[PDB]
Design a protein around this ligand. Structure first.
Ligand SMILES: Nc1nc2c(ncn2[C@@H]2O[C@H](COP(=O)(O)OP(=O)(O)O)[C@@H](O)[C@H]2O)c(=O)[nH]1
Ligand SMILES: [Mg+2]
Ligand SMILES: [Mg+2]
Ligand SMILES: [Mg+2]
Length: 164
């Protein structure tokens, strides 16, 4: 009996400091530290999930390579407390659309939503950007786990719809 029905390669991209590695560690290991992480110590993380009746193995990178790793899905992360990281999403997307797989799936993530007093990008602004690009949007906090599992499951769900 085969271990899994599907293998999906996922890449997290976005400006330095937005929480890409923290999002991965929370999802894959259910850990979080405020302490600086230069490297997670491995090239990628593996987690297996269930989608309807299918077992899906997720192979996830928090660093670019090929540059986009032949990813089936790309999670674009900004920090809701950092306006520059949000504006730069426009550039990340532009590069994905030109240089990643032609029909790669995309998800917009606004991270650090636990920091309500430091927020400078509204949820509505995040949603507007995602809508303009025809992609889904989710706000997360790696710190308290809010929406982290949902973000990756949502990404997997979008890929599955495309590959059947
Ligand atoms: N308050 C809060 N801080 C976060 C969150 N995620 C990451 N951080 C902080 O942001 C820093 C940068 O995160 P990191 O994962 O290294 O960002 P990366 O450069 O995109 O890989 C971390 O060291 C944490 O201090 C979050 O969800 N909430
Ligand atoms: Mg990192
Ligand atoms: Mg700027
Ligand atoms: Mg800058």
């Amino acid at each position: 009996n085969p271990e899994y029905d599907y293998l999906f390669k996922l890449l997290l991209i976005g400006d330095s400091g937005v929480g890409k590695s923290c999002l991965l560690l929370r999802f894959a290991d259910d850990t979080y530290t405020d302490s600086y992480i230069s490297t997670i110590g491995v090239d990628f993380k593996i987690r297996t999930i269930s989608l309807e009746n299918k077992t899906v193995k997720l192979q996830i990178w928090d660093t670019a390579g090929s540059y986009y790793r032949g990813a089936h899905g790309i999670i674009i992360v900004y920090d809701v407390t950092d306006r520059d990281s949000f504006d730069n999403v426009k550039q990340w997307i532009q590069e994905i659309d030109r240089y990643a797989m032609e029909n790669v799936n995309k998800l917009l993530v606004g991270n650090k939503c636990d920091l309500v007093s430091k927020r400078v990008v509204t949820s509505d602004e995040g949603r507007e950007l995602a809508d303009s690009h025809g992609i889904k949007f989710i706000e997360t906090s790696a710190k308290n786990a809010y929406n982290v599992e949902q973000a990756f499951h949502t990404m997997a769900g979008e890929i599955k719809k495309r590959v059947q």
